[PDB]
Design an enzyme around this catalytic site. Structure first.
Site, PDB file in Angstrom:
ATOM      1  N   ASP A 146       0.816  -1.211   0.000  1.00  0.00           N
ATOM      2  CA  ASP A 146       0.000   0.000   0.000  1.00  0.00           C
ATOM      3  C   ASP A 146       0.854   1.266   0.000  1.00  0.00           C
ATOM      4  O   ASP A 146       1.372   1.665   1.040  1.00  0.00           O
ATOM      5  CB  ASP A 146      -0.904  -0.050   1.243  1.00  0.00           C
ATOM      6  CG  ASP A 146      -1.776   1.193   1.417  1.00  0.00           C
ATOM      7  OD1 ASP A 146      -2.060   1.889   0.428  1.00  0.00           O
ATOM      8  OD2 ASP A 146      -2.178   1.471   2.569  1.00  0.00           O
TER       9      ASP A 146
ATOM     10  N   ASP B 135      -2.178   5.471  -5.063  1.00  0.00           N
ATOM     11  CA  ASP B 135      -2.444   4.589  -3.930  1.00  0.00           C
ATOM     12  C   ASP B 135      -2.688   3.121  -4.333  1.00  0.00           C
ATOM     13  O   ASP B 135      -3.825   2.686  -4.574  1.00  0.00           O
ATOM     14  CB  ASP B 135      -3.630   5.121  -3.124  1.00  0.00           C
ATOM     15  CG  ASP B 135      -3.838   4.366  -1.806  1.00  0.00           C
ATOM     16  OD1 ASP B 135      -3.146   3.355  -1.560  1.00  0.00           O
ATOM     17  OD2 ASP B 135      -4.710   4.780  -1.021  1.00  0.00           O
TER      18      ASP B 135
HETATM   19  C1  LIG Z   1      -5.828  -1.545   2.753  1.00  0.00           C
HETATM   20  C2  LIG Z   1      -6.730  -0.430   3.299  1.00  0.00           C
HETATM   21  N1  LIG Z   1      -7.195   0.483   2.225  1.00  0.00           N
HETATM   22  C3  LIG Z   1      -8.277   0.197   1.438  1.00  0.00           C
HETATM   23  O1  LIG Z   1      -8.603   1.003   0.580  1.00  0.00           O
HETATM   24  C4  LIG Z   1      -9.133  -1.012   1.533  1.00  0.00           C
HETATM   25  C5  LIG Z   1     -10.150  -1.050   2.508  1.00  0.00           C
HETATM   26  N2  LIG Z   1     -10.946  -2.117   2.599  1.00  0.00           N
HETATM   27  C6  LIG Z   1     -10.814  -3.141   1.777  1.00  0.00           C
HETATM   28  C7  LIG Z   1     -11.740  -4.317   1.931  1.00  0.00           C
HETATM   29  N3  LIG Z   1      -9.888  -3.154   0.830  1.00  0.00           N
HETATM   30  C8  LIG Z   1      -9.027  -2.133   0.657  1.00  0.00           C
HETATM   31  N4  LIG Z   1      -8.062  -2.180  -0.338  1.00  0.00           N
HETATM   32  C9  LIG Z   1      -8.135  -3.187  -1.406  1.00  0.00           C
HETATM   33  C10 LIG Z   1      -6.952  -3.090  -2.324  1.00  0.00           C
HETATM   34  C11 LIG Z   1      -5.781  -3.718  -2.170  1.00  0.00           C
HETATM   35  C12 LIG Z   1      -4.977  -3.332  -3.257  1.00  0.00           C
HETATM   36  C13 LIG Z   1      -5.704  -2.499  -4.016  1.00  0.00           C
HETATM   37  O2  LIG Z   1      -6.901  -2.358  -3.440  1.00  0.00           O
HETATM   38  C14 LIG Z   1      -6.531   1.791   1.950  1.00  0.00           C
HETATM   39  C15 LIG Z   1      -6.453   2.712   3.186  1.00  0.00           C
HETATM   40  C16 LIG Z   1      -5.827   4.087   2.876  1.00  0.00           C
HETATM   41  C17 LIG Z   1      -4.444   3.894   2.230  1.00  0.00           C
HETATM   42  N5  LIG Z   1      -4.545   3.008   1.044  1.00  0.00           N
HETATM   43  C18 LIG Z   1      -5.143   1.675   1.300  1.00  0.00           C
END
Ligand SMILES: CCN(C(=O)c1cnc(C)nc1NCc1ccco1)[C@H]1CCCNC1
Ligand SMILES: CC(=O)N[C@@H]1[C@@H](O)[C@H](O)[C@@H](CO)O[C@H]1O
Length: 335
Positions: free
Chosen positions: A37, A221
């Site tokens: 992330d 992101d």
């Molecule tokens: C990991 C927490 N995040 C999510 O947006 C998020 C939430 N909830 C679920 C169920 N999935 C998420 N991300 C799926 C994903 C993985 C790779 C691409 O997308 C974000 C938080 C802010 C910084 N950036 C990351």
């Protein structure tokens, strides 16, 4: 200090919304599915000390410090406040293996893990790929620790997210370079606009230029499923597409999906264009069905926002290099 090593992490693509790979923590290694992330800077996994009243802790792999002979206690409390939800727990140190590279890493053991959204996550935890300046607790992020070893060839890492959610590679992160197998043409670079964030200047957002006309910001992101903008930005974008607002998304009648116009993001003297096939979950072609768009509203607070966020919707089309040595992001056409 730069070495001679490139390494990769193979990713799984769950439904075009979640991309994650495996890391090992402790001795012996306890394996976790983790999102890599660029929008956050901390490592965390769910903890064996998470009350099983958090049902998300019943359904995910739990790190058990009591099963690791290389664990080192810290115990400082941490809360990680994301735009999609919050986790809380405490700091621990142990050996983490990622792509056959081993580092001693400070990370969060999460003891409070809300059912929404984490009961919807295939992944167990997160590996923050952002900068130490945005790390809660000032904990050295994992890529900074890897760089300290002097093994990686370049102070960069790169993301490939595939379009196919069984025989296929779901995605790939190269630590220490990029993989020519997954991009074509040249990289085009945009330099970072702000200390300690994978954030760049954006010069306009076009439908078929009616947004970001006098400049705005884009967080790149890797951990987000969608492209986002502010509520007011997305309201104007979505009126222009003719999409209906629901609770957590915008939809269009499925028959209308293929007719929708291109959306272009002006970044560093190049226009980055998504067609409707890049941003519509085209699940049927019926007028009786609704199809969701991979663009949502997300008001990100200061000092990071207000800002657009370019998540997996964008990265699927554009192979992305994150260049720590020169503080820039590079995009190229993914294959
Ligand atoms: C990991 C927490 N995040 C999510 O947006 C998020 C939430 N909830 C679920 C169920 N999935 C998420 N991300 C799926 C994903 C993985 C790779 C691409 O997308 C974000 C938080 C802010 C910084 N950036 C990351
Ligand atoms: C109980 C424990 O280990 N506490 C440590 C503390 O002494 C140290 O100063 C801090 C920063 O590294 O991490 C934590």
């Amino acid at each position: 200090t730069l070495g001679n090593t490139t390494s990769s992490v193979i990713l799984t693509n769950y439904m075009d919304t979640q991309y994650y790979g495996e890391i090992g923590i402790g001795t012996p290694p306890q394996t976790f599915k983790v999102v890599f992330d660029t929008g956050s800077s901390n490592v965390w996994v769910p903890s064996s000390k998470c009350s099983r009243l958090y049902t998300a802790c019943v359904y995910h792999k739990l790190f058990d410090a009591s099963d690791s002979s290389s664990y080192k206690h810290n115990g400082t409390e941490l809360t990680l406040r994301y735009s999609t939800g919050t986790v809380s727990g405490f700091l621990s140190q142990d050996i983490i293996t990622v792509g056959g590279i081993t580092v001693t890493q400070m990370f969060g053991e999460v003891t409070e893990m809300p059912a929404l959204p984490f009961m919807l996550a295939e992944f167990d935890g997160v590996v923050g790929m952002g900068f130490i300046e945005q790390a809660i607790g000032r904990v050295t992020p994992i890529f900074d620790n890897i760089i300290s070893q002097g093994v990686l060839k370049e102070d960069v890492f790169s993301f490939y997210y595939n379009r196919d959610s069984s025989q296929s590679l779901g995605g790939q992160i190269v630590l220490g370079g990029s993989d020519p197998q997954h991009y074509e043409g040249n990289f085009h670079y945009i330099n970072l606009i702000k200390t300690g964030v994978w954030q760049i200047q954006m010069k306009g957002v076009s439908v078929g230029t009616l947004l970001c006309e006098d400049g705005c910001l884009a967080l790149v992101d890797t951990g987000a499923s969608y492209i986002s903008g502010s509520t007011s930005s997305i309201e104007k974008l979505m009126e222009a597409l003719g999409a209906k607002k629901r609770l957590f998304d915008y939809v269009v009648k499925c028959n209308e999906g293929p007719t929708l116009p291109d959306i272009s993001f002006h970044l560093g003297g190049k226009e980055y264009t998504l067609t409707s096939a890049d941003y519509v979950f085209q699940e049927s072609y019926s007028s009786k069905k609704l199809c969701t768009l991979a663009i949502h509203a997300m008001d990100i607070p200061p000092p990071t926002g207000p800002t657009w966020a370019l998540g997996a919707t964008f990265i699927r089309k554009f192979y992305t290099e994150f260049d720590r040595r020169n503080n820039r992001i590079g995009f190229a056409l993914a294959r």
